[PDB]
Design a binder for this molecule. Sequence first.
Ligand SMILES: O=P(O)(O)O[C@H]1[C@H](OP(=O)(O)O)[C@@H](OP(=O)(O)O)[C@H](OP(=O)(O)O)[C@@H](OP(=O)(O)O)[C@H]1OP(=O)(O)O
Ligand SMILES: [K+]
Ligand SMILES: [K+]
Ligand SMILES: [Mg+2]
Ligand SMILES: [Mg+2]
Ligand SMILES: [Zn+2]
Ligand SMILES: [Zn+2]
Ligand SMILES: [Zn+2]
Lengths: 100, 252, 227, 268
Amino acid sequence: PLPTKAEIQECTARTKSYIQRLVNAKLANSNNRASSRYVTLLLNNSHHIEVVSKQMDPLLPRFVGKKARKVVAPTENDEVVPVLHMDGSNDRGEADPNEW
Amino acid sequence: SWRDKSAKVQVKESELPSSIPAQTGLTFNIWYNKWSQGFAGNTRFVSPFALQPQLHSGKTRGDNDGQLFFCLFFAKGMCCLGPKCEYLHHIPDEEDIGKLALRTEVLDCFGREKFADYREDMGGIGSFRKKNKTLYVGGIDGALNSKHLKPAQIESRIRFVFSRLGDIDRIRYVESKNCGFVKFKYQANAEFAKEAMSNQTLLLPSDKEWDDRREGTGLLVKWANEDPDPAAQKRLQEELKLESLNMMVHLI
Amino acid sequence: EINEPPPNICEQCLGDEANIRMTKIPQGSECKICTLPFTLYHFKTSKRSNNIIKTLICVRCATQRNICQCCMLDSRWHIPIQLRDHLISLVNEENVMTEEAKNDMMKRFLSLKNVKLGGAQITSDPSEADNIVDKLKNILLKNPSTKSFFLYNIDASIPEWKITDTVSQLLLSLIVNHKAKCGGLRFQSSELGERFVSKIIFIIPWSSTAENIKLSLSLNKLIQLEL
Amino acid sequence: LPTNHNKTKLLKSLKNTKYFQQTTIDWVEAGLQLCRQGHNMLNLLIHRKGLTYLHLDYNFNLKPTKTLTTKERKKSRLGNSFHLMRELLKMMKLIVDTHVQFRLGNVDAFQLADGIHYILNHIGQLTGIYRYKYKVMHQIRACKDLKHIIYYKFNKNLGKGPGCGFWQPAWRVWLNFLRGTIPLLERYIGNLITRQFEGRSNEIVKTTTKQRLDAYYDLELRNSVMDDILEMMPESIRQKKARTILQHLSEAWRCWKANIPWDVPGMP
RNA sequence: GUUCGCGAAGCUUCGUGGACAUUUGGUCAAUUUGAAACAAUACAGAGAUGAUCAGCAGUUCCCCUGCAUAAGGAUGAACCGUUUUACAAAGAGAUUUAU
RNA sequence: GUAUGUCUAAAGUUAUGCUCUUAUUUACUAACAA
Ligand SMILES: O=P(O)(O)O[C@H]1[C@H](OP(=O)(O)O)[C@@H](OP(=O)(O)O)[C@H](OP(=O)(O)O)[C@@H](OP(=O)(O)O)[C@H]1OP(=O)(O)O
Ligand SMILES: [K+]
Ligand SMILES: [K+]
Ligand SMILES: [Mg+2]
Ligand SMILES: [Mg+2]
Ligand SMILES: [Zn+2]
Ligand SMILES: [Zn+2]
Ligand SMILES: [Zn+2]
């Protein structure tokens, strides 16, 4: 079945929301205050708490952490996946290498 | 007692030293506060001040508050805020160690965060990953301006110095390595001493090199790797087991 | 990235208030383990408590060790991570370590992996934790006024603090060498010494099968002296 | 046409925070304080970079202290951001200094006016702004034009000489130049200090340009060819066996270039 | 402390009930031991190849300068070292063992 | 002569057919002289 229009609306809604958020994040991240104008509570147990973002001096670096680290990625291919081809060529498969 | 009296000033900010050490190089570097265009010769020197604890220790703003951290500059014996200081001014004890025992896992008694690893020297503030209580005490040769003392004399003087600042688990001087290993009752205490006698003098008024104390290079109080000696290793293991029994019974 | 994981802070640490107000600086420090930016959270435990508590490590690191992000202690038992790994190693097994790679690049890499470390696999699932606990439980079941003494027969394992505290209970200075065991004790006054002696592994002369003991002392002493 | 949505100004934004306060300060005080501030900033930046051997003079005229080792020299070639910043401060330092002089009892107000005018009409000649950002020649040229215009409306019956003030239109020019550049310097110096703090991005990837077009082309080509041959080749041969292939290709290319037919016997 | 109500002395003064106002900042703490970088002295002094030269690339868990997706750092640097198995099938000869 | 690249810059981590003697070539190198 070619996908349902209603379900396409779902997917679009989800992914569109996601990408808009991502782009917002990217934008408010960057130092160019110019691109700030194209930007489209918690509990840590049964125990309860209020999260806040303290506004910091607009001289000091916004994100003190980030420093362009080189980082090697671990693959995390914990689940194994096959590579699975179905053939068995003997006559043409052995006569060819002499040519190839 | 310390609690009987208010803490005296170590030294007034007039008497305090400036942040322009020694001109080690040709020009000063503003953003680093170090020197530059030349690193000819060693940087380190001997502390002008020392924690004379009974003459200094006392009440603070902190002793009113319940500030859980001790004054680095008290340990160094140079705090310019005496009773007006937020950080405390006295030798750490079971009561205060006990008081801050939650937080002190992650950070020092000087309220500064420990790190993953020891600084290659074992020189800076300890790692969180170890709960070390044992200070290596190098540079005794330098700390006494090349005074040919007896090993007994050395170890005794060392004892006199570090026993004053914290309860001792053990001390042992090593003639063959010209150094100390000064295990302490508590990690807080260890931290405190490690700053309190960093860059200090082992010399005394009775010694003849008393006015040359400044001119040498101070005590190199660093942290100690555990001994290869299996004589103490076994003991350590036993201690660990004992501790484990405590906590494990405490879980239920 | 998005603030997907929440902060992993324990109770004791955080303090007994129904509502604290903490702040989050995102991308707010490199952690204390893996040198890697993360959302730094911090708060005064009370309003008027001077000590802020800042979240030292990153959330991934926390999860990995299965610990608090402020205490560096296991979120279940509130104990040092190394210690808990030792405990786990002891019961149910022989070997459970949580090796942090002390090389700045590799640590980052390790942190990135979504894989629990030795002890963390036990303490994550509460059932397994409980099991471990129960197994652990199962496993369980003449005064010349000298002011200056020379104490001998000192257990190698005993510390000076234990000694001095004991003395205080029986009531100053003290010198001990665990090599020799020539416990060169000295009192702040002679009257105090008198008081002590009158109040009396406590073998105690007053210099200024005991035979074999003396021999053992002897050899040990000699060895110490050679050192 | 000015875009309207961005109605959060810089000063307004700053006002919103706690870390700024406001005061009524004399304009000369503001100037002098800003020279001091600017000087501290630039020195901090330079020292941070490590190159303490570049001594800033208080007149914002940068020069090296020692003879520079080649490495050191390379390090110290500060870019068109820092130098441009310096030049703007130099400009400012001049006029503020003139005001100070005026107000410090040295020079008469007419003398001040002339001084300011001189500065504006000779920004080129007083601060190598053009060096770093050459489009400032337009501004300089404009100022020159103004001077030419002004003087010859200022010296109709009056003879020749230096004593004309009237610094308005030139001043306007310089203001508009600053308006133009404020964005540019926010970007430039932004990136600069970011580099000082955060390392430079390690996802460098270079674009094609006229200079590296050919190399890129050829690498793309050999990648394509290699791919095709692997697709063709039924044994699933190793990369080392692709080396033979691509090397073969290279030779073929050369042969074509020569006009010698490339007829290797053993191929398929 | 202001003020609005009350009481006790002389519109003035002492005591009383209100209203107003009611949580700053810290990721930090003052020099060695929690991190710069060159610098100096010494030593060599630069890719092809015989020799002399322009380079542009590429890989890199190397970066620096640069506003940079220009460009330049010696063609920025390092890459040149090490190197055994999806190990087979067939024949011949020699040795042993068994039937 | 350089880029560039190494080097140094001080404090002690607790374990029991040949040898010979010479003279000559050629090559390379040489901020050494001509
Ligand atoms: O035309 P420019 O190259 O910009 O030079 C002008 C010009 O001098 P020249 O005619 O010699 O080039 C002016 O001279 P006049 O045309 O007005 O005679 C003179 O103006 P004053 O006569 O008013 O002095 C002015 O000099 P100043 O800057 O002192 O006003 C001077 O500019 P430069 O001195 O920068 O060359
Ligand atoms: K290049
Ligand atoms: K290259
Ligand atoms: Mg070049
Ligand atoms: Mg070249
Ligand atoms: Zn203090
Ligand atoms: Zn916690
Ligand atoms: Zn981490």
